[model samples]
Target: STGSATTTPIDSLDDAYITPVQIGTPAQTLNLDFDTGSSDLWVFSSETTASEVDGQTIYTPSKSTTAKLLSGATWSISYGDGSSSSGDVYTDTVSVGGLTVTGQAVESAKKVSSSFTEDSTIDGLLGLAFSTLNTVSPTQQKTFFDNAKASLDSPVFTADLGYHAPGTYNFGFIDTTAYTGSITYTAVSTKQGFWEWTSTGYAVGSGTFKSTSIDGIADTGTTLLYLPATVVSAYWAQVSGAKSSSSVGGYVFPCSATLPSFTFGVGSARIVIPGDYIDFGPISTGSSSCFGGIQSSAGIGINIFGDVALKAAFVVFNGATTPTLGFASK
Candidate 1:
């Protein structure tokens, strides 16, 4: 079987993308953030504190006859923005596009921090990463993608993240027309419970490709592209007036600075991120300084090829028996 759905950028900055997901018997449609970095399908629910609900749509399991409480099960996860959500679990029918997975564990948030409470664009997150990363106690649950993979024609899903525009996510089959050129395949390591892969190297502007290999995760949940300090420093050095500012945080440059394009290698293929993509707009409205989308991942524990990098190419999360990742120029 196959399925397809459109994912839209939630904000003008293209900070994150959300895809519609249906849960329970009658199908409670909720726009959820599809995250490849984490593995937990959690949502704002009626159980959440009334005051913390804000404008978010809550998933009411009591209204769904098909929903069943998974007694004693709970889940919790922390995010990059210092926000966290935790709740009890339930088993219910979950669907994405036309594909359905019955008896899927759905974590209903009882408590959500301020960051999640304020942003109403997404009701919750549907993690696409491996089930091994699931935080549920008593019994870890399989991700929606994992449960649907067995019935899918192929154990694969594609992420075509767009720059401030709607993109499509295809399950079970790849849409050849969605991308250009041949796809470069690379081995993926699930040891870290992420879509981890290694890039051959990278180039700044028209500079030569450095021979060093860089390992990173293709994280759609994350907002920006973060690399090692060495690579980030090299990229910022090319921009005039670019410097790490304590006041601004990370590297900031004059709003009028000319930014060079960034390119990274995937086997023999080279994916280039446009110069304008690196100019991540001014740090604040009417501010004279702009923040670079490519920042240092020095202390983050892992390098992340987030939305900024993902929008530059068509990516394949192949969940084959021997998992692999594919990158194609668009």
Candidate 2:
């Protein structure tokens, strides 16, 4: 599947990973990794021949009939993991997944950090997250969602990750068959990029925490759910004979008994984290004790519900309208 014409290998500077799309035409195609951690669509370019840059996919505008450069405006992004890259700005009529959006803001980088340089695969990233995380301001830039909202059939856009499959990232209209019902909509805060909501606290065994429910954000980019110290302790306590073990990390635990299922409420939608997910080594060491789903961020100041929670539901990112988020059964 990776070798298919529609699926391009996301490796190397000379190799084109992201497909090109015309602004008004749906015939062109582009393949990209949809990232919710940040906002912005970036690609590697022929202009980036710098010595420090390596292992990136570069785009040649001259090869594309619909390419349009965005003057000399430069762009760069730094992630929480300390990875960074710098590139020039360009405006293009790009296409992806049988859909075309015009005047899309994209970046073409000349130099990238070592982390990106070493990974010869993946040309660039397409940020499907919120506009608030955009490195460029609204006045100076516009995201793919901002320009495509008028043509979209629904007010929402859904992303489905095919896991380890080739061309795993696909975007377009939401497929009803992939979902169980209408999404559960949640109002998003204008400031943070996270989807904020109040859980009816957390439930362990038959005991419910009477304290204020945990307030946190849902991030598709991260793989783990980060919770407060008190919440983490309460959850681990319920597992029969659960004891803290210092093997994996600070919060690893070991118990000889099967743990009960835990449920977290979001409005009327109740989510249950299976006992297997709580166990750290479900595949490698099935008998090994599980780790706490909740970890202590201490002064981190925010709770994050990551991929573990996202895999259970169909998440709709509505940046086209006023920044709102919705969750439906998948």
Candidate 3:
């Protein structure tokens, strides 16, 4: 057995992590946002309505000799943020890092919301949550990771996401150099096709850890960390002149405001986010106002450990069986 692994450079665009992926016979390359929040590998493509497209590069099945249409199959996704997309499916060869999976479901977008159309850098989204979450109807499709599991040295991948900087997404092997200390792991629920987990409690600044159940998803596609309303209110209460405002969207604070660290539990381990990371930096470039990186989950129901929280710790996404989440300080 060959224990082959691949290390792909992760490009950071504000809060999203983009990784290069290849599709088709001759390898049509595209930069895709690897999202653990949702399942479905969809890209802007030839079939996409031109009016719905901006600067995003499109994938054309016509150009790929190996592309085969999956007749009667369709997929659609609408996220919590209101962004949505829908498309038909094609079976083709897909490769990420050094792993290759033939007949991977390559969703070709025919309709995309305005926000998605404006996001030129994100050509498509690679669904890394779970194959069971795949949206293809009639006959579901397996994700790239699932298709390559048998060939991987280990059925695992690591997301070393960074804050406004580049990181790495390793396939088939763990890069010990990326993290320090022993990784603390917790069992994840993929029943709904998400890396769902519950925390024993949370703490603000030097405050005692409050024992309350916090259930959430480890999502790489999201930008901010969302938590329960009560917890969000408590954190902002500590900062003077901080309030939830629609004008600034979510919670807004003065640029000079001092913040307190936020800590949350993960099984037997506790990960604390620095107070500085909570600031999210001056709201809009030179503006003195600042928006919080942490916000209220509100109507969304469940919380989300997005890039804001994920970058604070090195993460391992084990796809072997009964997917598990491993977190450790970098």
Best by TM-score: 1
What is the per-residue lDDT of model 2 for residues 1-330, given as tens digits with 9 covering 90 to 100?
A: 000113333431112223333332322233454556667677656776566546554666666566677775667788654777777776667766555666788777677677666755556677766666667532356567656666766555664322212222234355666668676676676566655666656666567534356777766554456777777777777766565444655465564556655666666666666555454432135556555555665546777766555545666666544666666655
Best by lDDT: 1
Winner by lDDT between candidate 3 and candidate 2: 3
Question: Cα RMSD to native, each candidate?
Answer: 1.0, 6.3, 2.4
Which pairs of residues have clashing backbones in candidate 1?
none
Q: Write the per-residue lDDT of candidate 1 for residues 87-178, one digit (tens) a residue.
A: 99999999888989999999999999998889998899999999999989889999999999999999999999998799988899999999
Tell how far residue 24 is off in model 3, in angstroms: 1.4
Clash-forming residue pairs, model 3? none
Per-residue error (Å), model 3, residue 6: 10
- What 10-residue stretch in candidate 3 is worst by lDDT? 1-10
Q: What is model 3's C-alpha RMSD? A: 2.4
Q: Candidate 3 lDDT, tens digit per residue, 1-330?
A: 112222232333255767888889898888899988888999999999999988888899999999999999999989888999999999999888767888899999999999888878788999888888888998988887778788878888788876667777777887788888889888888877898988778899999889888989999888889999999999899888888988877998888889998988887788888887787776787987788988999878889999878888888888866778999888
Off by over 4 Å in 1: none
